[PDB]
Amino acid sequence: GTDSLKNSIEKYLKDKKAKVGVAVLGIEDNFKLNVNEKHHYPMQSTYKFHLALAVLDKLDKENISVDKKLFVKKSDLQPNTWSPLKDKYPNGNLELSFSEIIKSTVSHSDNNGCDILFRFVGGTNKVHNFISKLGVKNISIKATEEEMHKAWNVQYTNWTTPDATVQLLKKFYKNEILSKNSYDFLLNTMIETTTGPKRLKGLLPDGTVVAHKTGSSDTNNKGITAATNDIGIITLPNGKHFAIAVYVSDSSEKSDVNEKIIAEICKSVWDYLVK
Amino acid sequence: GTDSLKNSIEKYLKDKKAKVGVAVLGIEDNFKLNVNEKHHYPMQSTYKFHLALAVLDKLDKENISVDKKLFVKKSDLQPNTWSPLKDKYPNGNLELSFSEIIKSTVSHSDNNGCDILFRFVGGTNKVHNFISKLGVKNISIKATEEEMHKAWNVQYTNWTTPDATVQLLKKFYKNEILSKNSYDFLLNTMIETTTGPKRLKGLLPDGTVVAHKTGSSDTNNKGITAATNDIGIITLPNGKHFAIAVYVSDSSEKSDVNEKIIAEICKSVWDYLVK
Ligand SMILES: [Cl-]
Ligand SMILES: [Cl-]
Ligand SMILES: [Cl-]
Ligand SMILES: [Cl-]
Ligand code: NA
Ligand code: NA
Ligand code: NA
Ligand code: NA
Ligand code: NA
Ligand code: NA
Ligand code: NA
Ligand code: NA
Ligand code: NA
Ligand code: NA
Ligand code: NA
Ligand code: NA
Ligand code: NA
Ligand code: NA
Ligand code: NA
Ligand code: NA
Ligand code: NA
Ligand code: NA
Ligand code: NA
Ligand code: NA
Ligand code: NA
Ligand code: NA
Ligand code: NA
Ligand code: NA
Ligand code: NA
Ligand code: NA
Ligand code: NA
Ligand code: NA
Ligand code: NA
Ligand code: NA
Numbered sequence: 076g077t078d079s080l081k082n083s084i085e086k087y088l089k090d091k092k093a094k095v096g097v098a099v100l101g102i103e104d105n106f107k108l109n110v111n112e113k114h115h116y117p118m119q120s121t122y123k124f125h126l127a128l129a130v131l132d133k134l135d136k137e138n139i140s141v142d143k144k145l146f147v148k149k150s151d152l153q154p155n156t157w158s159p160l161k162d163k164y165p166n167g168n169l170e171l172s173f174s175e176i177i178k179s180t181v182s183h184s185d186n187n188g189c190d191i192l193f194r195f196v197g198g199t200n201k202v203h204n205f206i207s208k209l210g211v212k213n214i215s216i217k218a219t220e221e222e223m224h225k226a227w228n229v230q231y232t233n234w235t236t237p238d239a240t241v242q243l244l245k246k247f248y249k250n251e252i253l254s255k256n257s258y259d260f261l262l263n264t265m266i267e268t269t270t271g272p273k274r275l276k277g278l279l280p281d282g283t284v285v286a287h288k289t290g291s292s293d294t295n296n297k298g299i300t301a302a303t304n305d306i307g308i309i310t311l312p313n314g315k316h317f318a319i320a321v322y323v324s325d326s327s328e329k330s331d332v333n334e335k336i337i338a339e340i341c342k343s344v345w346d347y348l349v350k
Numbered sequence: 351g352t353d354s355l356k357n358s359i360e361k362y363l364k365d366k367k368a369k370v371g372v373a374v375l376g377i378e379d380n381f382k383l384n385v386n387e388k389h390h391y392p393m394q395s396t397y398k399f400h401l402a403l404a405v406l407d408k409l410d411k412e413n414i415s416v417d418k419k420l421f422v423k424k425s426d427l428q429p430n431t432w433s434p435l436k437d438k439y440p441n442g443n444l445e446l447s448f449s450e451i452i453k454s455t456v457s458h459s460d461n462n463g464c465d466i467l468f469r470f471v472g473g474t475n476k477v478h479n480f481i482s483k484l485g486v487k488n489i490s491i492k493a494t495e496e497e498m499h500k501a502w503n504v505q506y507t508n509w510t511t512p513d514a515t516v517q518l519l520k521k522f523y524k525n526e527i528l529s530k531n532s533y534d535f536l537l538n539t540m541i542e543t544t545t546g547p548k549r550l551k552g553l554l555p556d557g558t559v560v561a562h563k564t565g566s567s568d569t570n571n572k573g574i575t576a577a578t579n580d581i582g583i584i585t586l587p588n589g590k591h592f593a594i595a596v597y598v599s600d601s602s603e604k605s606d607v608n609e610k611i612i613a614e615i616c617k618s619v620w621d622y623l624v625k
Pocket of ligand 8: 112113114213236237238239
């Protein structure tokens with residue numbers, strides 16, 4: 076049962092030198108599991124999901140096609156930051172569709188796409204408020220990728236509880252937030268994600284559908300990796316779904332271990348729910 | 351003349367809120383210009399040139415083909431760092447040639463490729479020593495990309511004077527360091543660079559050959575961008591060449607201005623040498 080699954084996860088965590096938050100919520104059925112859920116975990120890129128929700132809601136409500144294009148200045152494409160968009164368009168100064176920018180920001184975790192979209196939607200506060208008004212408490216959106224890059228502690232201002240995340244994922248998956256077509260688009264984009272293949276997906280059967288968004292910090296001079304995260308919705312063999320969010324925070328472990336913590340926890344949940 | 355060109359550059363710098371180092375050295379002819387050259391400027395990615403020299407020298411001396419392959423672990427491909435290699439191979443755990451890795455590291459400034467190559471060649475000290483033994487003083491190579499990312503000041507341990515850079519570029523261009531074939535390869539790789547198209551290249555005639563390597567820091571909480579750099583060898587219309595290195599350091603200016611400082615300085619030099 077759920078209590079025994081929870082105990083297994085807690086036992087697994089006993090020798091990991093990290094603070095690990097876990098939440099799970101069934102979509103169709105009533106399953107719920109939380110571990111270490113009352114802490115505030117740094118989100119890193121996982122908040123590009125929240126951002127995409129706010130952007131697609133604005134495009135919906137204002138009747139703006141996702142095929143309309145922003146002018147992306149070269150200055151919008153900062154160097155020495157993770158950015159597949161910048162490598163694809165190294166001169167910048169070009170027109171890119173909201174669709175193209177959202178796909179890169181979500182599926183490929185583009186840091187420059189993220190900030191382009193924050194500027195479009197009206198800033199971090201707009202997104203913070205948007206999420207809060209969906210009725211999901213315990214999420215804080217305060218800093219852009221550029222801002223996070225300026226100073227180590229700024230990432231902690233973009234925080235969440237793990238149960239907030241899965242509450243939000245469930246509202247999403249049930250298409251309670253967006254238009255049908257914007258929902259379909261963001262869901263496809265989340266399944267198309269290419270980052271974190273050894274996180275939630277890592278130990279699940281080949282071809283399992285995992286609609287997800289990763290997040291990753293750097294490491295400080297004390298050996299601490301603030302955030303190694305993955306959040307998403309997984310399709311079970313009988314077509315039902317569960318939302319899961321894992322935050323491996325403030326870790327002294329190497330990256331292979333941090334990813335494996337996510338993969339193993341997810342595999343434990345999968346095995347329980349398929350049984 | 352050179353003195354008047356120097357005075358023009360110094361006048362140009364008077365209203366820029368940055369500390370800007372410049373050096374120029376003719377390759378075939380005896381031209382020399384230095385501005386603010388006695389400071390120690392953070393290199394950032396420009397030291398991937400030095401790294402490539404050390405790597406290609408090792409491959410030469412040990413008789414290892416550039417087509418031989420390293421196993422690149424997924425852990426070698428860190429997240430949330432600039433890395434076209436990681437976006438191309440998001441699962442990692444694959445065999446990649448030295449050639450492929452060097453091209454990505456130099457032409458596309460890959461941060462993970464850089465560290466893969468530092469590990470191959472035997473670490474930062476090996477590269478530091480290699481450069482020092484070419485007879486070029488005033489270069490310090492101390493920290494990998496991973497190390498720089500851990501703490502703001504670590505980038506300053508990877509420092510250079512601008513005149514050291516052009517001395518090294520000239521030894522290179524005259525094929526005094528490597529085998530003919532490794533020289534040809536690295537030169538092609540430097541012309542193929544796609545980063546910094548609005549730096550040294552920015553205001554030169556379309557199609558000008560510029561074999562170069564950029565470097566870029568992030569910005570801190572005080573608004574300072576430690577490094578915005580570009581170094582290379584430029585072909586004049588009569589087929590002769592000059593080496594140039596520009597380091598825009600500790601800048602309070604926005605990125606468009608920092609890039610423009612490089613472009614304008616280079617254009618001033620170009621205009622003088624073509625006349
Ligand atoms: Cl592409
Ligand atoms: Cl929705
Ligand atoms: Cl490619
Ligand atoms: Cl050479
Ligand atoms: Na369910
Ligand atoms: Na439920
Ligand atoms: Na609990
Ligand atoms: Na909670
Ligand atoms: Na376009
Ligand atoms: Na994309
Ligand atoms: Na950015
Ligand atoms: Na909230
Ligand atoms: Na931060
Ligand atoms: Na909560
Ligand atoms: Na995926
Ligand atoms: Na994936
Ligand atoms: Na995953
Ligand atoms: Na720890
Ligand atoms: Na760590
Ligand atoms: Na010359
Ligand atoms: Na000279
Ligand atoms: Na001088
Ligand atoms: Na000097
Ligand atoms: Na290969
Ligand atoms: Na490449
Ligand atoms: Na790296
Ligand atoms: Na030296
Ligand atoms: Na640094
Ligand atoms: Na020197
Ligand atoms: Na180039
Ligand atoms: Na270029
Ligand atoms: Na350039
Ligand atoms: Na300054
Ligand atoms: Na600045």
